[PDB]
Design a protein around this ligand. Structure first.
Ligand SMILES: Oc1cnn(-c2cccc(C(F)(F)F)c2)c1
Ligand SMILES: Oc1cnn(-c2cccc(C(F)(F)F)c2)c1
Ligand SMILES: [Mg+2]
Ligand SMILES: [Mg+2]
Lengths: 546, 546
């Protein structure tokens, strides 16, 4: 029966409420009880406050009207306001105090996940204060989670006027009985109740959620911790930079603040960062999530040498030149991990900070061919298998769904050992035709990768593994250097190829290296443990890259 | 005969030279003459300095080696270094002191403009200091102006070694006698002179340029002031954001720092900002130069109401939501000008600062139909002509080259009065078939517009003029407000449609409005007076938006 949920902003989705600041100020200052609320509400439907909420005047225009009101209310109560009494001050402080009420947001999210239409209906104002950015940020963060945001000051109507509820119903394309409406002000609930909408008077959050759960029959309280926000590909800004005549690089871009370039591994996609992109933008960064050369909407030339580290890095430098970025933070995973270490070694002036997930920095051994080094470790055998052009391409392209479904698996779900792959004759020779879905990925998500890999297949991606000698020779030029810029190494306990112990000597080359470690996390770090990745990157960014 | 010019960075393209800082420090500190230069050069081809310049070690690794050298040189000279003597300190200060030598850059630019291949050949280092960003910025700014940048530390060779000159020749694809090489160090010139390259020992810049002029036969000194840097479309990062199902917006994006959204007029393009884009990025901003709805690579739906201000503005808000920008500075020209004023009035929380070129803010007259208001001013008659769907489309699409060539003209070059356009039967009825090229635009530039307008023609663009009533009604909701965020109005003396006097009452609505004014500047402000536009926007940005 219920198909829609509507939330207020002040006192419901955001706390503490700004009305509450009138009460507290009166109390803090020993003013007559309700003096500030009287001034705020003075003139009722014709007063300054309503014209503000209807969008007739702006917040900065309203400020000295409320001031006048405060003076008038205090003369008639026969009291004085303190020296320095400041409405601007009181509201600045109240508006920055007010934060997203996380359990209300997460209930709204859950309800939208079971198919509810969700809306924010709020009485609010045109905010032109020097400090307005703080509220623009809150509204941005909230509104991406809802179907509609309806603001008194944009539509020229205010709760409790009945026309705004009709406007609400009309926006929702729902009858009143399909709707639950939550509000902290009972007078604002009444007209909803008059049309026969379910209403909830929100005082403390848990009681409101308990009522909300009973009436929708969905569990909202005590629910397990949800995944971070993911990205919908078609809601992203897509960017394209030609770094040389046959090579354009695609990236997805979100956020403002210091530039942070995310570099995925094999055989992946910008979309492998789908969990870190909103979180890092939300944390104050400008995220650029690449399709690395060979992938997705980036160019994929056929030639092996187009994918040696040297060329790849020079191209990332050019990519920063064309965007006008003198630096970026470089964060990589797997092959992208190896690439960001090389960026730090050969272009430290361009790298604000470098971080790698799973991929350690191991200096080239000048006394041993890279092929032999790879032959010394049974678990890198899959790399020898990748050498012969065409062999791995045919297996990996043969059935794309089965490919990503077989590869993208948590540590306790694996269907393919990386063990004697050449000898067995391939990666999947002993894996099912139709693997089950990993807990880490939905069917929709696999199909995004499948569709990405239909453009260029696996030639470009596999080429990354076909410059062992060339990369070794280039790496050997850097053997006297150290990495002395800010650097984070994140190891993954259950990555059985890029094992944590392979990073154990990194302090010899990177003396001030910082670390994170993620337990029960396989090779596909970002999607396996997205919450922990986010927490470790954002903490390191704020302390070291900012 | 000469086909190439090669410049050094230190002492030639950038001043003062960092070597010079050794000399000055010795002098400032009363050290033995040449003590710091001895320490810097200690060990010659095997010393710390060469390994730095060859890329073997990084700058931060070199610092305590130079320190050791300074200690050793001072014991053998039988003196002590001052308490607090700091090599890091001396080099930090020297490297930030060093600036682009503007007349050398402008000579290099001029030479490249007459078809020279230009290169920077420099002995330099891998810079991993906390402060390295300053040098990354210098190198970015310089290198976009040259064909090649060759850095000792990237190629593993140093001046004066002869192999780097062979590497130079090979990169240039030129014989030695087709090359002039400028350097401030005579020893570095010698091997160039040995191959028979023309060399110039650069002491003061003007003498070096005088020699450079004599030997190339091109005028380099006393040359008129050049245009700001323009943009090559295919060197830009191109961005695309879907703001709703049939509407994606394209923009070009350069720079980092506060976001600055540029909004062009009718019938224009992101490329109308080609002169402001590098300059504003260079000044510390993140430029987003739009194709407004109806133009270029942005979508162009047919329906009139898709182009009313309300819809257009809401879409710009969504564009910021999808990019994750809580605000941007909005700068507009002509129709884009009108749009940014409406953004400031209806979404001040999203607008960091607002500026308009030519377009004044005039509040809607609630007592007069907008059509009548337009009929009251002979010079807006072209707007009535634009009303009837299809009429203006047919004239403007009939011959695109002639269209932009007729429209894009400086004030003393005009070929069409905006005078009684309806009565005459069109905009061009009394203009030539093949107009001459305006001084403001090259044939190549006109052809960029022609090609942009081949995708959707003039329906979407003209639609901007077809919501007089709808825009008026929406504007009337804002008549009690004031614009109280930071705001700049730039008037253009010889715009005979958007005349400076039409802005004269703006302080009534925008009490703290700032102003610029550009003399001898027609309607096409950005390309007519690009240098003055840049100076007025960047000054206002730095003082009001930052
Ligand atoms: O512990 C584990 C499970 N899978 N991996 C793995 C690591 C790197 C690449 C690849 C491959 F190339 F197969 F994609 C697989 C490591
Ligand atoms: O002083 C001058 C010369 N041209 N304009 C002008 C202004 C706005 C639009 C247009 C048009 F629509 F024609 F593009 C022309 C003003
Ligand atoms: Mg409330
Ligand atoms: Mg020099």
């Amino acid at each position: 029966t219920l198909r829609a949920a509507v939330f207020d902003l002040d006192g419901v989705l955001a706390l503490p409420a700004v009305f509450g600041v009138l009460g507290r100020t009166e109390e803090a200052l020993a003013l007559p009880r309700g003096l500030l609320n009287d001034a705020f509400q003075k003139g009722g439907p014709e007063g300054a406050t309503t014209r503000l909420m209807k969008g007739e005047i702006t917040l900065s225009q309203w400020i000295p009207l409320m001031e006048e009101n405060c003076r008038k209310c205090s003369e008639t109560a026969k009291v004085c306001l303190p020296k320095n009494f400041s409405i601007k001050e009181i509201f600045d402080k109240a508006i920055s105090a007010r934060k997203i009420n996380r359990p209300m947001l997460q209930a709204a999210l859950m309800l939208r996940k079971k198919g509810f239409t969700t809306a924010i209906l709020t009485n609010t104002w045109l905010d032109d204060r020097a400090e307005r950015d703080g509220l623009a940020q809150l509204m941005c963060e909230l509104k991406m989670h809802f179907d509609f945001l309806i603001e008194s000051c944009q539509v020229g109507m205010v709760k409790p006027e009945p026309q705004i509820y009709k406007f609400l119903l009309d926006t929702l394309k729902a009858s009143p009985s399909e709707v639950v409406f939550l509000d902290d002000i009972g007078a604002n609930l009444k007209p909803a109740r008059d049309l026969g909408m379910v209403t909830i008077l929100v005082q403390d959050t848990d009681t409101a959620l308990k009522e909300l759960e009973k009436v929708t029959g969905i569990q909202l309280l005590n629910t397990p911790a949800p995944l971070p926000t993911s990205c919908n590909p078609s809601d992203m800004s897509h960017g394209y930079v030609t770094v040389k005549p046959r090579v354009r690089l695609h990236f997805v871009e979100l956020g403002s603040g210091p530039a942070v370039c995310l570099c995925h591994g094999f055989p992946e996609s910008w979309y492998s960062w789908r969990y870190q992109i909103p979180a890092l933008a939300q944390a104050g960064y400008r995220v650029l999530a690449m399709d690395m050369k060979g992938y997705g909407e980036s160019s994929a030339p056929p030639e092996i040498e187009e994918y040696c580290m040297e060329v790849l890095c020079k191209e990332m430098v050019t990519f920063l030149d064309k965007l006008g970025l003198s630096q970026a933070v470089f964060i990589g995973h797997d092959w992208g991990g190896m690439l960001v270490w090389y960026m730090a070694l050969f272009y430290p002036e361009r790298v604000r900070a470098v971080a790698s997930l799973n991929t350690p920095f191991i200096p080239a051994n000048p006394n041993m061919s890279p092929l032999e080094s790879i032959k010394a470790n049974p678990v890198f055998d899959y790399q020898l298998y990748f050498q012969e052009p065409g062999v791995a391409e045919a297996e990996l392209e043969q059935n794309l769904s089965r490919t990503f479904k077989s590869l993208f698996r948590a540590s306790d779900e694996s269907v393919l050992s990386m063990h004697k792959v050449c000898e067995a004759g391939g990666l999947f020779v002993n894996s099912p035709e139709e693997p089950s879905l990993s807990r880490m990925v939905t069917e929709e998500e696999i199909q995004f990768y499948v569709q990405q890999f239909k453009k260029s297949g696996f030639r470009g991606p596999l080429n990354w593994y076909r410059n062992m000698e060339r990369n070794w020779k280039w790496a050997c030029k850097s053997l006297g250097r150290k990495i002395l810029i800010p650097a984070l190494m994140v190891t993954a306990e259950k990555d059985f190829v890029l094992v944590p112990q392979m990073s154990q000597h990194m302090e010899d080359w990177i003396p001030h290296l910082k670390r994170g470690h993620i337990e029960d996390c396989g090779h596909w770090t970002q999607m396996d443990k997205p919450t922990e990745v986010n927490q470790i990157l954002i903490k390191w960014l704020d302390s070291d890259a900012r």
